[PDB]
Write a protein that binds this DNA or RNA. Structure first.
Ligand code: NI
Ligand code: NI
Ligand code: NI
Ligand code: NI
Ligand code: NI
Ligand code: NI
Ligand code: NI
Ligand code: NI
Lengths: 120, 120, 120, 120
DNA sequence: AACATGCAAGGCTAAGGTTAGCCTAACCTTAGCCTTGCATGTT
DNA sequence: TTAACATGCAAGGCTAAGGTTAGGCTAACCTTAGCCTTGCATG
């Protein structure tokens, strides 16, 4: 719905946290994604069950090999979308990332590869 | 979501059905979106509740002004999307409808306008 | 529903038909279990899918070994119920079969054996 | 079919819950009949629709006259079955409640009465 | 005396629904529960 | 004339508990409509 796909926006949010140094904590995801505290815990749990993440003893989020995989793919697509929007389509900059947060969840690998060549 | 957005695809199915000049019946949506007979009626219901369609006395689906407005909208983005993918991106033509059936539900109005221009 | 357990009541009706040497046909089950002809064919279909029956070239029902097994167990419990109600409980003789038509479907094998000692 | 009769088992659960002094909450039915949260809400609603219960303002389940009448009946046949099984049929005392949990939904008043008499 | 049509059962299938039951993924609110870091007035 | 001092307690981060919507599904049933293959009964 809002997130088009939750697991992906959760995986991306975690990855983005690690990227900026911040400890990947559920409380963070909650605030970053505008969702309630127990909602996040529940979903993360669901994801842990699905073998995407793991909660550590220090309560930090640890992505599994499969987790990262999916994570870097959404990140990838996010950029690739953001580019296509700003250049080829030429959408208002202040609206770009907003658009890409959605397209990122519905862009196939096929197009992904295709698009990397196209942009250039 | 398999349909990304269920309501937009139920509307597009009705509209397209109408173009083909085939009475729009739930059993028809059923075949096309591959869902159980019960699931379709249950959904058309929520839909009729939010006033997007009306189930006639002869069981045909009648889109309300709102329903028709959205339908055209979705339908319009579908084409602009199918286009964007073939013209500038260049993706295997055989995989273009499917991709566009996903993009149709995440494309913003602004991106719809900026796209009618860019493409020539 | 009314039949408590359709598959069981179908298997028994077939077996009973065979017992009285009458071609076991769907139109025959419809007659006895008082259900619409399309309903009967659909259900039998499901049963065939479940490896309980097979519909021959002449369109007669043919219980598979797993099917006859089920069939005899139902039939067997039906008798043990009809007896328990008449001998021990002493329920009105007319109302006896109707009651047993239900208990037949909800009596464990466990209880079956026991009742075969007590009852006689 | 897992409950044999879904409505009769909801009443009984509400009823038994009241005997134990536990507030009859939908969540309680879920725990006990082991069903999904959303499944219990539907079923109760359907029940409320046919006026067998009323969801209080503090969310408690209020059995209506009709509902309680049924409840008791069920509750009554449960015990009669439980005895009949353990007293004249002599079945594993351990496996008696379960067996009774099924018989309760298929026992006639006609038989209920005959049973109270034929058990000294 | 053998023919013919003349179809009507009888037995299904094709279509399109409906109810009752059940389920998961996501979200929410309202209540506590542990740690921690320390402000604050105290010896 | 301030180091030295528990320790008082609100954040911060969760879990607990009970729901809700949206979206899906299967088993069982129904009515209508149409199709096909014989068992006769009338010219
Ligand atoms: Ni970005
Ligand atoms: Ni996103
Ligand atoms: Ni198309
Ligand atoms: Ni679509
Ligand atoms: Ni009998
Ligand atoms: Ni029966
Ligand atoms: Ni008991
Ligand atoms: Ni029961």
């Amino acid at each position: 719905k809002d997130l088009v796909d939750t697991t992906e926006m959760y995986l991306r949010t975690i990855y983005e946290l690690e990227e900026e140094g911040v400890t990947p904590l559920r409380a963070r995801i909650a605030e970053r994604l505008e969702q309630s505290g127990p909602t996040v815990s529940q979903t993360v749990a669901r994801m842990e069950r699905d073998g995407l993440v793991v909660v550590a003893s220090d309560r930090s989020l640890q992505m599994t090999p499969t987790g990262r995989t999916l994570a870097t793919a959404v990140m990838r697509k996010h950029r690739l979308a953001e580019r296509l929007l700003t250049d080829i389509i030429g959408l208002d900059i202040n609206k770009v990332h907003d658009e890409a947060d959605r397209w990122e969840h519905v862009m196939s690998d096929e197009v992904e590869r295709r698009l990397v060549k196209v942009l250039k």
